[PDB]
Structure formats: structure tokens, C-alpha cells
short-chain dehydrogenase/reductase (Serratia marcescens), 463 residues
Amino acid sequence: HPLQGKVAFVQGGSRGIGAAIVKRLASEGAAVAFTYAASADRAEAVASAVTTAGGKVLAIKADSADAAALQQAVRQAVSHFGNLDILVNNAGVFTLGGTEELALDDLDRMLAVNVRSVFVASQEAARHMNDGGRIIHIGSTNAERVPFGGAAVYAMSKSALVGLTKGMARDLGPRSITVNNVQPGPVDTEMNPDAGEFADQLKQLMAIGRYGKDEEIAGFVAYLAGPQAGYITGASLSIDGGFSA
Amino acid sequence: HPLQGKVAFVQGGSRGIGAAIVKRLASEGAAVAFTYASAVTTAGGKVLAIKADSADAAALQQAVRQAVSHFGNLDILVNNAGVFTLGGTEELALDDLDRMLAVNVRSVFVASQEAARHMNDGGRIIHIGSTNAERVPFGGAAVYAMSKSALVGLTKGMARDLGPRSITVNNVQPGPVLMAIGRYGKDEEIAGFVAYLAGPQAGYITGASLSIDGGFSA
């Protein structure tokens, strides 16, 4: 239990990668608060997965586009569990449009969820974090490699996390808080499943020829949140099957 | 002991980070051969120390073969040799250029090729590079940074070559063992990152240059 006694907040913990992260951190001993945007049934299941196994959990409904909701969710977690040790920013919207086509509303939505709300959750969490803490953003390998059209604004919103991570590491380093950007490739989830011709085309671009598994991303995030990772900070860390080689 | 039954080779394993990597992989259950013909081991033990200078290719290829004779095909190779000589562009001696090219660049490839010829599918190759591949704030480090940035293209192309065997290839970039965190790193922190990459949770990480540098390169 390398995270015994620690308190984690996961923004976007109800499905796929975020569910695996919440379960992973609780299995290592942390108390976990998480936000979910859509399904109280789905969040109840993740919360039960944590507690059937003997872990402590708070689920919080919050729209990641709404900054006040995210600030409120961090304070409600702190009232529940005390000051945070770990923050994982896993909200995301993955949405396609060429440069000449994308709607202004879809731009403003990916900016709000994937960029703005990562900063807003990070600032409130840091206000209520212990020294020695961990902030982990979940970016994308599309910050580094964009092989196809239609991903310009998605890739912009993910490459924004590279400069945020460097700068936040410089701000929070004197408090021994690390800040890192995890850049996944394709991961088998129920809205991006390893099945179909698009998945087969992405695999051809990868060195490993298979999608990642939710649990593999959770295992990297738990390592970075743990007591052996206090020297890793400011970094953009690819876990993408070689997509960006 | 998730490395129970697995076999690792560490090039440069006798002190500091290299020792810490040997001790962490053995503590997780691995057989470990490392370089630092002469060898020492313990009866009933699974750590074998082999004397080999990292500039000498034939001694490296033999050491790998020795390790495979004792333990079977490799699962893990860690390339941790390294030489660091300071010198400005105008002054650095060519002998010192050639020492850093042989140790930091050439022998990393020679060991990787021999290990790839005797490695199980699903294996792991981990190079130990440097944060100076990304950030070189002062003079005197040009050829050292040149030798460490070489690992970035080596890692990418080796990940493409060996991916079909499910072997991952990554480049760990340490800082000192300009900082964002206000302390140097510990040998055991580098070893913990190499052990994670070398283990069964890390099969999706390949081709990457992964900084563990206290925010030196931020």
C-alpha cells in the first residue's frame, strides 16, 4: 500500500481510463474523490468497486466545462477527506473537424474541457494540497504526432499541457509537488474500442501493433503518484505503443 | 517478485545508479548479470558480475553470451555505461571525443544488438541517457550532450525494429543524482523507474525518452 494514508482527487473518474485510475489508487491505499459528468449509475459502480475491496471513496457529479463546479468539487473533497496529496486530470473531449470546417462551439468546448479546466482544477487542488504532492495531467500522444487531418484543435488542446506542465512544475517545485503530463496513445475503451478499421489503421502506426489497456495507463499514473516518483517533474511522458516514434 | 524467472543484463552495474538498478531487479526476483575475462558470483546466487570495459565491443558481446549461458535468454537489458568529459568545442581532445562516442553511443548499440539476438519476445531494452539531451544550459557539454541525444533516435528506431517481438525500447533521461525541486535525485529513484519500465505493467511504453530530472529540463 504505497499510497496508504494519501488522498487523491481524480477529475473524470467514472469510465475507462479514469475508472481504472480511481480503482488503482484506492488499491494502493489512497482515499479517492472523483468527478463524473454524466451517469450516476456508472459512478456508483466505480465507487462500489473501491469499497467492496475495502477502500474509501467520494463520487462528485461535476461538469468539467464549468469552472465553478470544479472548484466546488475540490473543496467538497477536501471537506470529506482532508487535504489532497494527488490530483489526476482526466477529463477530455475527442472531436473531429478540419481546420476549414470545425464549428466555433466545438472549438470552445475542447478549450474548456481539455485546457481551461485542467488549469482550474489544478489551481484549486494546489491551494488544498500537501507539500510532497503530485499533479498528473492526462494529455495525448497527439501533442507530439498528428498523422492525419481533422485533429488540429484536439492536438492543440493536448500540446497546451506540455507548457502548462513545465510552468506548473516551476511554481510548485518549492513545495516538493511534482507535475507531469502522461501522453497516452490509443487505449481500448468503450467509446474508442480496439475493433474496426480505424483501430486497425492506428495500430499500423504503432511499434507495438495493439491498443493500450486502461489498466496499463492506471499503473503508470499510480507509479507517478507514489513515493518513488518525487524526482519526476515537468515531464511529458509518452505511453503510446510507439505511436510517436 | 514480478521478475521471478526473468533474466536481466545491466551494462555498468557496480556503483551508484548501476548498482541500485542491479539490487532492485534482483530484489524483484530477476537473475542479473552486470558489467563493471573475470567474473564473480555466489553459489546458489543469481547475480553475476563480469569485468568488461564498455568501450570494448568483443568483451561486451562475450559478456552477454556469458550471461545467456548461465541463465537463458534475456528478458531485460539496461544500458547504464557513461563517460562525461567536459571540454569546449575548440579545445576538447579527440581522444576524449572518441572515448565518449565509444562508451556512450557505440557500445549502447553493440550491447543492444547482442541482447536482441538472445532475448525473449516480450522483453525490455532500457537505455540510460541524460536530461542534457534536451537542455544544455552551460558550455563544455557539447560532445557529452551529443552522445546522449543520440539515444533519442536510437530508441525510436529500435522500438520500430523490435516491436513486432513485443520488446519495448525506452530511454530514461536522468538529471543530477535550474532544478524545479531543489534537491538532487537518489540512485534508488532512478532504479525504481528502470524497474517499473522493465516489469510487466510497462509493455505499452515504447520508443519514449522519459525524463527523471527534478525539472532540470522544464
Remarks:
- The beta strands of chain A are 7-11, 31-36, 57-61, 84-89, 129-138, 178-184, 236-239.
- The domain at 1-245 of chain A is CATH 3.40.50.720 (Rossmann fold).
